[PDB]
């Protein structure tokens, strides 16, 4: 069952996919049991990396943008984004 | 138009495959191999999450 599978993936990865808080074009990726860190992304051309908690330095943000637009790897973006957000907390 | 269809597409693309018929998770790997984590044990949620993420990146 799709919703049950989602619930299980959320519990295993502690990764929740939510609507953007600010805009309709953003996807918010929330990491952690308590939802302690998050990052928003958009593919509407105005920007790629949106807001995040904790906020990240320009070099970290440029690496994340490159993983999405140059390598086109959504998985590697989530692994790197998760590492950066947890390390910067 | 369920957002659960696209969410599952995202979760599978991470290389994490649910195999509940065998009470286990398949983690696609660093070395290009398959890691299998059972779910029918006393493993905490915290350990299982740590185990999975550690095997998705370099």
């Amino acid at each position: 069952n799709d919703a049950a599978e989602v619930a299980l993936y959320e519990r295993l990865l502690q990764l929740r996919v939510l609507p953007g808080a600010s805009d309709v074009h953003d996807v918010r990726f929330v990491f952690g049991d308590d939802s302690r860190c998050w990052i928003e992304v958009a593919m509407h051309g105005d920007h790629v990396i949106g807001n995040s908690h904790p906020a990240l330095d320009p070099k970290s943000r440029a690496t994340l943008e490159h993983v999405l637009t140059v390598q086109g790897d959504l998985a590697a973006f989530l692994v790197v984004a998760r590492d950066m957000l947890l390390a910067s907390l | 138009a369920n957002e659960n269809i696209l969410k599952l597409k995202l979760y599978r693309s991470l290389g994490v495959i649910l195999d509940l018929e065998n009470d286990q998770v398949l983690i696609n790997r660093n070395d290009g191999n398959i890691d299998i984590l059972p779910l029918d044990n006393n493993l905490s949620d915290f350990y299982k999450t740590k185990y999975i993420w550690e095997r998705l990146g370099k």
């Binding site: 996919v17 939510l18 609507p19 953007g20 309709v24 074009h25 953003d26 996807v27 992304v41 958009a42 593919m43 509407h44 999405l68 637009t69 140059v70 390598q71 086109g72 790897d73 959504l74 | 138009a1 369920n2 957002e3 696209l6 969410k7 597409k9 995202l10």
Partner: peptide
């Protein structure tokens, strides 16, 4: 592993999540 695919996928997901 393609930027056009990730672009259209994230466009699709933000649309469904916003609805």
């Amino acid at each position: 592993k393609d930027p056009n695919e990730v672009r259209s996928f994230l466009q699709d997901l933000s649309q469904v999540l916003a609805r």
